[PDB]
């Protein structure tokens, strides 16, 4: 039951649940007398489940391929902060990958105490 | 501003009028014609590339809006101007090989 | 600079050392007051900068200013990948791509 | 030719700005004293920060509230600027409660009073409510030091609580100025001036005292030589 | 006129002279009209290769260190000492080059 | 660089022969559980973890150290392979 | 949740070389401790140095002495490296007298003994006299801190005296390095290594202790605000 906490009574992860690699999003069983064929979060992905959409046979405007009873889609959101390895660029063709994130006290600062935010190498010019 | 306007990403007032209702998902405007017009806002929508495009209201209830005035900012927009990044304080100097 | 002068502060000793170095470098004209040389450096877009690790100034004036920078869609999060073993292709029986 | 103990002068503006002058000092000691104190002040001063937020009928950060102009992300961004002062040294965490109905401009002053807790910026704008909108919030504020991302601590009080990135440092800016001075016949002596801007939760004098204590405690560590 | 490299570098640390000023230093039993920076570079090489005479033989003292001179120094160090000591020298050169490029202005 | 790599390169006429000798010695050490080593109990390669120093599990490092000591004989057609393995097993089960 | 107290390790090579390792430390504290200690060690450790030299028949430092192979500069440079220890704290300045004549190798130990003064390197080479060469010199040694050039003090016992740069600092060199280290899950901690070369009159451990004490005494100055502007 630790692996089935976030699923609702219909086998779909609930809205607002946090999902990490290996967690189940939609439960599914297939005749093997049945076996696990559920949808899980791939490695390196996850976040907050924000939407679920279910399309069933007969629903107005739905055109499923023959043989498919229903389809379930899950929308999962991520808030990505800047990290080492991300790419930044200016409008003049200067692009580069973030290689180091320093604490404020290590940054060069103006005589009035204001630190700089970005240090660019002059050799690129 | 022309780039933001021509992409149809932001929302602009159709006619001279006054704003009646403001919400995170709705703007209702009362034009001088007397007709109430409700503009729904696209909120947290997945683009083809996985980025989230949402519109955020930039108007208050009771505010007077002229024709073409901004009502809601689109993605990568700040007061109707294209906003693709951030203005940061930079120093041009080597730093420990990093 | 009027901000600093209003609060009751003069020129720092480290600023004097940097001004001496820039005088040797040929960035400022000899015979001027420290404030005049500082203004000359500022008009060249350069300021005296201090090292946060030591507190000593950078030995020369450094170009500092506001820049517009954007984050690009190339994110290391979406690229980092590793595999020990996994699926294999039907015919060649070789790892998938 | 040893130097007399320097004079120490204190100037204060409100609870937010402080100037601390030490003079006269030997040549080179202005930087030697100012820089470690600046680094400690900017890095290691404990404070308070918003660590958790719960909103009624809100399931995650990526939603909107009917009758409220701002989305949850922008509300949390506004709440990250809240300055809370704990009047009690033993106090470790508080939960502030907010209940409002539109139309109004919900500010930080609309929080219900709590004992031994003060809000240093009651004018800080939180949200805008229109007719029909309501806001019921519970904000958990903790003591701590440094910058702790929400993904690190992961603090949730209820099922639908939203963890918030915590910036515990109360110090906003630290500068120091080394000026030339003299004493009788000696020349090229140092006069040090520390300028400290805080958020008002902790005064500059308190922050300076804590930084000095931290430096003294770290200097203590050089007292037990051991063989290699 | 300095008795040894340590005195010259201590004077540099006190702001008496800069690394680029030409002074007189007594090193390896000789009186060299050189700068404290070049003496420091010589010491960097000597401490990297753990051999003072060979390092003195390898380096070109009376020129600024640029790409070609550094490449020649690396090749000569390889030939005279082996790849392990060459790797140590390369790491030391990298560290000190980065350190002095950061503060050069 | 690997310690003593210059000496190891000078000990052989071809660098690939050095690689082959190192790999075969590492296989020998792994097969017998490091009981056939020629290293004295204070020359053993160590590894530092939280609990304490233990033996280095990497057999290739052991093989290079042993080659450095000079107590190993290598060459072409020294001993028949089957007899070599049987004798090794006899000394070290 | 504050981290455990760090471990301090020493490694001493005679009275001349020392390495000191402090680890683990909070992020950024490695340089925060290393830089002020380096500045104090190079600037503020009390010591002694040769401050003046008088040699007869010598008019300036760019002259030469018949009978002595070296010029005046070489003797002054050799005297710059003389290491002297004062035995009692009341003593401030000392004059050491050197009488030499005849073909000889003039070393440090040839100085006339003075009381409550000790030459730590008597084997140091001062000069070489040939046949018919003489050397009668008076060296004035004082106690101070840091490095003071000759033109800054310019002290002279008499008109023919030559001022000498005073290397008061007993510490010859200080280096320090900060390396990343981890403990448990935390991976942004610091390990600080300090290497100290002294002249032998003071051990590196004593110099480090004196620097730490100086820093503590300076930190005690932030307490009583006599002026309340």
Keywords:
part of a larger assembly, 7 chains, A: 125 residues, mainly beta, OB fold (Dihydrolipoamide Acetyltransferase, E2P), three-stranded antiparallel β-sheet, two-stranded antiparallel ribbon, 10 strands, elongated, D: 228 residues, alpha+beta, Gyrase A, domain 2, RNA Polymerase Alpha Subunit, Chain A, domain 2, four-stranded antiparallel β-sheet, 4 helices, 14 strands, transcription, TRANSCRIPTION-DNA complex, non-canonical cap, DNA-directed RNA polymerase subunit beta
Question: What does this molecule look like?
Answer:
This is part of a larger assembly, with three copies of chain A, two copies of chain D, one copy of chain E (105 residues) and one copy of chain F (93 residues). Chain A contains no helices and ten strands. By secondary structure, chain A is mostly beta strands. Chain A has a domain at 1-81: OB fold (Dihydrolipoamide Acetyltransferase, E2P), CATH 2.40.50. Chain D has two domains: 3-46 and 169-222, 2-Layer Sandwich (Gyrase A, domain 2); 47-168, RNA Polymerase Alpha Subunit, Chain A, domain 2. Chain D contains four helices and 14 strands. Chain D has 228 residues and is an alpha+beta fold. Chain E has 105 residues and is mainly alpha-helical. In chain E, 64% of the residues lie in helices and 10% in strands. Chain E has five helices and two strands. Chain E has helices at residues 5-13, 36-49, 52-58, 67-81, 83-104, and strands at 23-27, 30-34. In chain E, strand 1 (23-27) and strand 2 form a beta hairpin. The longest helix of chain E is centred in the last third of the chain and has 22 residues, at 83-104. Chain F has 93 residues and is mainly alpha-helical. Helices cover 48% and strands 6% of the residues of chain F. A two-stranded antiparallel ribbon of chain F has the order 1-2. The longest helix of chain F is centred in the N-terminal third of the chain and has 17 residues, at 15-31. Chain F is flat and about 45 Å long. The chains are: A mainly beta (125), D alpha+beta (228), E mainly alpha (105), F mainly alpha (93). Chains in contact: A-B, A-C, A-D, B-C, B-D, B-E, C-D, C-E, D-G, E-F, E-G. Chains D and G meet through strand 1, strand 2, helix 1 and helix 4 of D and strand 1, strand 2, helix 1 and helix 4 of G. Strand 12 (86-92) of chain B pairs antiparallel with strand 2 (62-71) of chain C, so a sheet runs across the interface. Chain F: Its EC number is 2.7.7.6. Chain F: It catalyses: RNA(n) + a ribonucleoside 5'-triphosphate = RNA(n+1) + diphosphate.
